[PDB]
Write a protein that holds these residues in place. Sequence first.
Motif, PDB file in Angstrom:
ATOM      1  N   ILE A 133       0.766  -1.294  -0.069  1.00 55.32           N
ATOM      2  CA  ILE A 133      -0.007  -0.153  -0.035  1.00 55.32           C
ATOM      3  C   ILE A 133       0.966   1.361  -0.134  1.00 55.32           C
ATOM      4  O   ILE A 133       1.610   1.249   0.817  1.00 55.32           O
ATOM      5  CB  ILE A 133      -0.908   0.182   1.215  1.00 55.32           C
ATOM      6  CG1 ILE A 133      -1.925  -1.228   1.335  1.00 55.32           C
ATOM      7  CG2 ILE A 133      -1.826   1.238   1.365  1.00 55.32           C
ATOM      8  CD1 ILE A 133      -2.223  -1.434   2.786  1.00 55.32           C
TER       9      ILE A 133
ATOM     10  N   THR B  33       6.971  14.835  -3.050  1.00 56.45           N
ATOM     11  CA  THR B  33       6.293  16.262  -2.644  1.00 56.45           C
ATOM     12  C   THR B  33       7.346  17.277  -3.257  1.00 56.45           C
ATOM     13  O   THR B  33       8.687  16.918  -3.368  1.00 56.45           O
ATOM     14  CB  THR B  33       6.010  16.423  -1.205  1.00 56.45           C
ATOM     15  OG1 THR B  33       6.713  15.901  -0.474  1.00 56.45           O
ATOM     16  CG2 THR B  33       4.646  15.623  -0.909  1.00 56.45           C
ATOM     17  N   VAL B  34       6.936  18.575  -3.299  1.00 60.91           N
ATOM     18  CA  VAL B  34       8.102  19.513  -3.579  1.00 60.91           C
ATOM     19  C   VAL B  34       9.270  19.622  -2.491  1.00 60.91           C
ATOM     20  O   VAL B  34       8.899  19.885  -1.419  1.00 60.91           O
ATOM     21  CB  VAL B  34       7.338  21.029  -3.796  1.00 60.91           C
ATOM     22  CG1 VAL B  34       8.361  22.056  -4.397  1.00 60.91           C
ATOM     23  CG2 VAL B  34       5.951  21.036  -4.578  1.00 60.91           C
TER      24      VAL B  34
ATOM     25  N   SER C 277      12.557  20.905  -0.023  1.00 65.12           N
ATOM     26  CA  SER C 277      12.798  21.969   0.872  1.00 65.12           C
ATOM     27  C   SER C 277      13.087  23.186   0.157  1.00 65.12           C
ATOM     28  O   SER C 277      12.766  24.220   0.612  1.00 65.12           O
ATOM     29  CB  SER C 277      13.812  21.433   1.928  1.00 65.12           C
ATOM     30  OG  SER C 277      13.314  20.305   2.496  1.00 65.12           O
TER      31      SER C 277
END
Lengths: 362, 50, 31, 231
Positions: C9, C17-18, C20
């Motif tokens: 899963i 994600t974008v 730092s």
Amino acid sequence: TAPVRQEGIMTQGDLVTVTSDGIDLNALWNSFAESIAIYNEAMDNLIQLLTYPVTVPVEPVVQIGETTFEEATELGVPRGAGLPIEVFQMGYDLRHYDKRNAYSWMFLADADGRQVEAIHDAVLWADKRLVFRKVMEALFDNRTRRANIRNQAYNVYPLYNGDGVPPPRFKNNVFDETHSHYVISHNSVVDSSDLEDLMELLAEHGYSPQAGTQFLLLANKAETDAIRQFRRGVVNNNGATAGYDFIPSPPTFGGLAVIGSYGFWNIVEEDYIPPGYLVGVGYGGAFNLGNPVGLRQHANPAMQGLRIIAGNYQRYPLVDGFYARSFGTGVRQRGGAAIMQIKASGAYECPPIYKKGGGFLV
Amino acid sequence: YQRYPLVDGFYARSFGTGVRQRGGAAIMQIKASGAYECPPIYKKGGGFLV
Amino acid sequence: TAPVRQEGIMTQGDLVTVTSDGIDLNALWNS
Amino acid sequence: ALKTKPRWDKYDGYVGNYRGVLGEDIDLDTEANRVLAVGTNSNGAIVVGAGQTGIKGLMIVAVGADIHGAMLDGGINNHAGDPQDVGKHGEITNFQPTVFGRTFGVAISATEGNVKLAVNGVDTGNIAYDTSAANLKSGIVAVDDGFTADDFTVTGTAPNFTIVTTRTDVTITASGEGVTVTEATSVAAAGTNYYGHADGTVNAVKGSDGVYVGHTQEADRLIVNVKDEED
């Protein structure tokens, strides 16, 4: 109502029916809703006074330098100027909560719709109580927290507590890193000195009646019963002389009833404050204090607010559904409030009613 | 699983194979001695990727 | 060097994600 | 904000305050943002301390820091062959004396038995109230903390010693009774003459090598006027 809460799948035998006497017990679900509205008005007024919506998840704390003129001369030149800057960062957390309602087909076969509405209303009341507990927990639990935002980890702070960046210098006052706004009376009963020392914890940072700062004192009945004794130049408990009278009201701070004042404290008596604690909060004035706690939501509008979600069980014999909210908390104006515990000696303790591990209701 | 806490979904294909004109092609393996070996990259039980 | 397959899963902590420092790694899956 | 750091306030640049190039890398933790006494080596190049010429000026290697308070490594004014500015005549503001490493005075109150010191809070093996200078070294070195003999120096005689160090990350303290320890401290003092040394330090004491670099006025300032070192 009581601290009794039934859980598990709703079945037949959890059904409520008209009796042989003709009493429609399903007409009684609305009966306690007057108290629910009264409790909601009370918790709403505390949330509206204590909180603001966080528009950005992370905040800078800035310190900036200082400079002076010099006595001039002919022939010579001045001593130059430059301006150092130091920056620290703090956030607000964000956490996830859920509740489940589930019914067997035999309950759904016979139940009155007023019984399922009574459960939806009991869940909306438990949602209000969760947001209230987390708001109060953000103020009373003096431990520093961590949160991840945009792939970086941040400190999430309460009031001053001996952790993080020390308070900035004011006009003459300067503070070391051990400085704390969680403190004790050093006596078993409240003094006038305690309300005056609690006021100093705000005024030391310039959150002062001279700056036009308005002040709220939130206290248990057990403290306000002692505070009503205080008179100018007269001794109280523990040898403390009072610098003010307690002045009774015949008025509200926000929507909460002000019982009276002692100096610049508007005193509100509130049973949600545990016995032996005083909470002093500053508002408005020249530093323009906002409400002490920030509430953070998720960034996506589809994640915001209380949500109802269709469950995993959707067919005979059993149906369920989820209620979900995600939100979190943190303090920006770490000096704009203070908490004192009335005790003779030792450390401040977070009351078990508002400590982080203790539960989801108040 | 469709909402909360899990969502899933499947991909599926059905197909198969066989040879009709059994004489229309041949395979030689370059080796000194012993049987023909099916190369492991194209042996039936060996996996589902080339 | 030799291939590995991630299987299970997909949870938080499997998110891309974008960064730092503002690299949109999700613009790059077609690379 | 948090700290002030030394800077040139008046530096002209036409009056024998001079450009040169560094002969060596400047240590950013130990030598940047400090008042360095400087000479020149046998090439044309600036060195910290006495080169071939002796002390000929003062240098401030001004370096920024990130928002977390660490020095920016990729500078262009701090490696060997980078160009730098050396002052003979001028004023330095936010002045502080310059010292390298840590140094601790140790003195023993005990007149019998043994005493104990802590290195970064961990306790040393017992040492006599009359240990040798050789056995303060051996005691202080002998713990499983990883510093070893290579970065301690010891000198003294039984009542007291100086434990010198080149590193900043090692702290001596007393831990037993019968011994006292003070780290030395340096801060500017008003109306004082400052002195550059062959180490490149700037201090209020002229020992056997001190070359006058200026005098302070109010402690936060130095009026630089280098009495250039000579043969």
